[PDB]
């Protein structure tokens, strides 16, 4: 993606403030819990009939973890975003079968999350920015898709 | 909301559908794989080869649920009650799919009726699909 | 459908928003129109720059309309009825637009309500948006 | 647009066959009546009171012929619609003010009138080639907004 010097700046001070695991597992936890539908992808992920039950799975944490690591890796490279993600493309389309209409809402919840942790740092240009990259990220993961 | 004159003009095309509604719901769904491929996601059970059985049945239920809403246009969702449970709690499919289909049945619809698809009943249609999409994703959360 | 608990969430998170709406609508109007730039189109007679009064002055107009929709959260058309007609009939803006405002408000919220935003919330507050948004659009054709 | 040569074939055959000119002015109209707020930009143009009213309309077939001879036009130039569109696009930004969305809203009008058109001929493999022109289309047409 085409970011700003200014937008560039203002992504990569933040994301050196986040702790993946901890941001990674309140992001999924919140998609569970506002789109419950997206719980069609983890049945076998334990108990998520509540926002407790969702928000204290392990489980949940630790996909989080692992979907948000995934996710720093693209920061690193803005530039390439469809070159970076797409063997987890193929993966997604292929064997996971996910509706890429997934990797949108989960960038909203992440820019909400962002936004919850952070407070006024989170200033509307921030998001802005932040907006850009989720919207990359979500295109560079359905790029794959047949 | 459709107007009564939308009821009208939806029982007016339904009714010319007739009995070719499975086909036509089979041809919907064919237009749908193919031009938004990301629909497939949700029928990776399925032999989607161009006129499989599974296309061909499935087409079927689809048209005689849409006959059901038709029949019952004055009272959606208590007609469509048990599809709109399924679809929120079983199939979980996301609502965005829901437009790319009416936009097909809406293609395939033109494409068999020449005379009937005016402007005003390509407006009713349109909107009738909303409502259907509508009532279908209306117990989600 | 507002279940009674979305309805005391939504009710106890705008308690809290309290006096500073206002604020919050202008700060949501601004989030919108840098993430979103297309929605700009609508207020070309605006000045859009950050502090502008004009968006002040329409993020309180806005803030004002969401508290008297929590305020009537059970009639929620009929409240809503001038602002529906005028949504529909003279500003005519298109119903993608809801969705971008709705999800820059909540993170408005998010930004400034820290333990109030807790999961729950959040999802009672994306459903209210979402009915509050549903009625803005329901005469547009 | 990446299509396939089979794809720019079968949309530049059925292409040979239309009357701009009508389907132009067929198109608008639809756009009008199916969804009425996009009728916001044409109050210059008199009386879309109905159906009857806005399909009549001189002006309405005259914005339509204009509209769809650029369309067309792009239609010659598949593989650079961006460079093609970029001076429209930052016209119907900066003085049209038109939300992007009307574009897309246009482009499954258009697939609609051709199918009513065309019939049986407008198979799923033709209407699969003609998406993704109109959305390249109005990708191309959204490009330039800030
Ligand atoms: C930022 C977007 C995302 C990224 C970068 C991402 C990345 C990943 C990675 C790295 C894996 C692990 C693959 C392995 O080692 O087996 C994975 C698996 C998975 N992802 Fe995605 N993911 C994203 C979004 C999503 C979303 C939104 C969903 C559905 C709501 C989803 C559903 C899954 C599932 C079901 C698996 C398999 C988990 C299991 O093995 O049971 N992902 N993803
Ligand atoms: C007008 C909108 C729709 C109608 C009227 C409709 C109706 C139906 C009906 C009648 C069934 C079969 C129920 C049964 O056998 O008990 C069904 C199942 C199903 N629908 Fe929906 N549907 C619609 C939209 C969608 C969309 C947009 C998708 C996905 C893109 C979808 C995916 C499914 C799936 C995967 C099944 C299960 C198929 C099987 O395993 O047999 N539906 N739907
Ligand atoms: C929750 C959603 C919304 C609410 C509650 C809302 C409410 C209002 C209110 C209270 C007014 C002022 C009416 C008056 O002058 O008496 C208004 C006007 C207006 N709204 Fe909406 N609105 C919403 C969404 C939108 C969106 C998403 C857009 C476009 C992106 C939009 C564009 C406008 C415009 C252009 C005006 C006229 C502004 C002026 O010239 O003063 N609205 N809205
Ligand atoms: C395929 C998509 C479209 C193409 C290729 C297109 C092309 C054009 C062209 C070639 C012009 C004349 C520019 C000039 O004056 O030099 C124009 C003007 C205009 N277009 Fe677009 N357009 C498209 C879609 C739309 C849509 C969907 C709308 C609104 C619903 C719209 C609204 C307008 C308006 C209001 C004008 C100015 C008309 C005038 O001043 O008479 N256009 N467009």
Same sequence: chains 1, 4.
Avoid at chain 1, 37 to 63: C, I, Y
Avoid at chain 1, 115 to 126: D, R, Y
Avoid at chain 2, 113 to 133: I, N, R
């Amino acid at each position: 993606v085409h970011l700003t010097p200014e937008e560039k700046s203002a992504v990569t001070a933040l994301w050196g403030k986040v702790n993946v695991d901890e941001v990674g597992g309140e992001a999924l936890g919140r998609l569970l819990v506002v789109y419950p539908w997206t719980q069609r992808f983890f049945e076998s992920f334990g108990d998520l009939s509540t926002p407790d039950a969702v928000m204290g799975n392990p489980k949940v944490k630790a996909h989080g973890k692992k979907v948000l690591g995934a996710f720093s890796d693209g920061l690193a490279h803005l530039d390439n975003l469809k070159g970076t993600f797409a063997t987890l493309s193929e993966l997604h389309c292929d064997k996971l079968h996910v509706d890429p209409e997934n990797f949108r809402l989960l960038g909203n919840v992440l820019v909400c999350v962002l936004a919850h942790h952070f407070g006024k740092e989170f200033t509307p240009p921030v998001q802005a920015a932040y907006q850009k990259v989720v919207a990359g990220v979500a295109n560079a993961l359905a790029h794959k898709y047949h | 909301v459709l107007s009564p004159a939308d009821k009208t003009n939806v029982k007016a095309a339904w009714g010319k559908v007739g009995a070719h509604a499975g086909e036509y719901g089979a041809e919907a769904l064919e237009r749908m794989f193919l031009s938004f491929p990301t629909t497939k996601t949700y029928f990776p059970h399925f032999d989607l080869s161009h006129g499989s059985a599974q296309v061909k049945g499935h087409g079927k239920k689809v048209a005689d649920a849409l006959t059901n809403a038709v029949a019952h246009v004055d009272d959606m969702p208590n007609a469509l009650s048990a599809l709109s449970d399924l679809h929120a709690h079983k199939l979980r499919v996301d609502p965005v799919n829901f437009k790319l289909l009416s936009h097909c049945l809406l293609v395939t619809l033109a494409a068999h009726l020449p005379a009937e698809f005016t402007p005003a009943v390509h407006a009713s249609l349109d909107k009738f699909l909303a409502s259907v999409s509508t009532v279908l994703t209306s117990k989600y959360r």
